[PDB]
Amino acid sequence: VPRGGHMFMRVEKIMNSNFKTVNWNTTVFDAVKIMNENHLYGLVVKDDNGNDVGLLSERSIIKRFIPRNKKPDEVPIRLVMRKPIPKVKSDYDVKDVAAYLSENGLERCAVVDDPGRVVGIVTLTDLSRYLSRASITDILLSHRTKDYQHLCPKCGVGVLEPVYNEKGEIKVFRCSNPACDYEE
Amino acid sequence: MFMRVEKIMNSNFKTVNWNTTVFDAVKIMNENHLYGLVVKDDNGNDVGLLSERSIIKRFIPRNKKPDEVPIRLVMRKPIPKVKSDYDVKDVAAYLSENGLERCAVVDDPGRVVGIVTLTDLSRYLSRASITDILLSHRTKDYQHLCPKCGVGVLEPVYNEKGEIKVFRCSNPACDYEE
Ligand SMILES: [Hg+2]
Ligand SMILES: [Hg+2]
């Protein structure tokens, strides 16, 4: 829906409510087919019980899939997606969303309502119609230089860090929580 | 109202050989935080530009390991480019027309002297132009013109799994494929 330029705007009004969701065991190959077909580069990921566990983006594939050096059909997106799902509340002003994305090096994130349900996805493109020139440049620079901190699904507090081998391949992402023993 | 790209481009770009695997090329991108590489052949010719989107659209669908595919079959080709004397507004029109968010910049002689990205342009473009480039990058995809006839476009040929086997020229009068 056309709205014209405005300094303020609640995210809910500009987000994409027609977002697509995919299961967390979907392979990278099958997930990307959906992205290419729909010209949609952000998918919400759900586990087998309907819980929103992450967001799969182009950058997540470049940063977390390619380095594993495996065929796209051999890697479930749960190992690639941004997790926990990046998100902002539906009542956020575009300015607040910009700060959230920039802080996390993201160019898109999910939007959740008060009850916590995912109601849409908002991207830099959506925001570009309202943000200041400087804010847009900020998000762009932050997306190039920063990377989202993925948290451990086992303890929920540990940070998943890359473990490389001699070929530079990411063997696994290991939880940084001392009290936790998790690798994937 | 005016600003030529040569002034804002990045002449500090990185070049990789066209036989570099997707795996090695992406490692370079990730380590440098630069998601655009100029690709050259074995004789010093600038033959293409490897971008994130090119990997998502032309590498992933092949369902092959990153170390088994040379970037020459993935990169944008012919190489996306604008002349160094182009005004930023002209570059914006070029990127948008081609669904790109970055392209190479060449000098009179024709060699690549830099790379210009949407981020570089974001400081000199109107908000409308920036949004335009963003929209076009999502909705349009770069057209890989056939090198043999120059008019046909290379289209993916899929197998029963939806895996890309080759990119074949659309021109009926042409037999090119890669
Ligand atoms: Hg953990
Ligand atoms: Hg051709």
Residue of B nearest to A168 (CA): B27
CB of B42 closer than 8 Å to CB of B20: no
Contacts of A39 in chain B (CB under 8 A): 138-139
Chain B residues within 8 A (CB-CB) of chain A? 22-23, 26-27, 29-30, 33-35, 52-53, 55-57, 60-61, 63-67, 118-119, 122-123, 127, 130-131, 134-135, 138-139, 162
Phi, psi of A144 (to 5 degrees): -75, -35
Pairing of strands B154-158, B164-169: antiparallel
Going by the DSSP 8-state scheme, the letter that residue A84 receives in this structure is S
Give A121's Cβ-side CA count (13 Å radius).
Answer: 23
Distance A154 CA to ligand 1 centre (A): 5
| Residue list, CB under 5 A from ion ligand 1 | A 152, 154-155, 158, 175, 177, 180, 182
- Tokens matching residue A118: 């995912």
A18 beta partners: none
B112 beta partners: B106
CB contact under 8 A, B57 and A36: yes
All domains of chain A in start order, with CATH:
1-184 (3.10.580.10)
> Could you give the C-alpha distances from A28 to A17, A34, A47, A65, B22, in angstroms and in order?
23, 10, 15, 8, 16
CB of A22 closer than 8 Å to CB of A77: yes
Contacts of B122 in chain A (CB under 8 A): 133, 136-137, 140
CB contact under 8 A, A67 and B30: yes
Helix extents (H) in chain B = 22-32, 52-58, 88-98, 118-121, 127-139
First to last CA, chain B: 43
Q: A133-145 and B127-139 are packed helices; what angle lies between their axes, rounded to 10 degrees?
A: 40
Write the single-letter amino acid at A59. Answer: R
Ligand nearest to the backbone CA of A182: 1
d(CA A34, CA A57): 12
Query: Do the annotations mark residue B146 as ligand-binding?
Result: yes
User: Which residue is associated with the tokens 């230089």?
Assistant: A145
CB contact under 8 A, B56 and A66: no
Lateral strand order in the sheet of A21-23: A21-23, A42-46, A52-57
* Angle, vertex CA A152, rays to CA A150 and CA A155, nearest 5: 145
Query: Do the annotations mark residue A175 as ligand-binding?
Result: yes
- Tokens matching residue B123: 């400081």
d(CA A153, CA A84): 8
d(CA B66, CA B70): 8
Q: Which burial class, exposed, middle or buried, applies to A33 when counting CB atoms under 10 A from its CB (0-12, 13-18, 19+)?
A: middle
- Tokens matching residue B55: 């990997």
Residue of A nearest to B128 (CA): A129
d(CA B164, CA B46): 25
Q: For residue A33, give the H/E element and its range.
A: helix A28-38
- Tokens matching residue B16: 């990789």
Method underlying the structure: X-ray
Pairing of strands A170-175, A160-164: antiparallel
d(CA A155, CA A175): 9
CB contact under 8 A, B23 and A73: no
d(CA A73, CA A155): 28
Of A112, A116, A121, A107, the closest CA to residue A91 belongs to A112
Q: What's the longest Cα–Cα distance across chain A?
A: 53
Residue of B nearest to A135 (CA): B122
Pairing of strands A108-112, A118-123: antiparallel
CB of B14 closer than 8 Å to CB of B35: no
Helix extents (H) in A78-132 = 94-104, 124-127
Looking at chain A, which runs of residues are DSSP E strands? Answer: 21-23, 42-46, 52-57, 87-89, 108-112, 118-123, 160-164, 170-175
What are the residues whose beta carbons fall under 8 Å from the beta carbon of B166, sequence distance 6 or more?
B156, B157, B177, B178
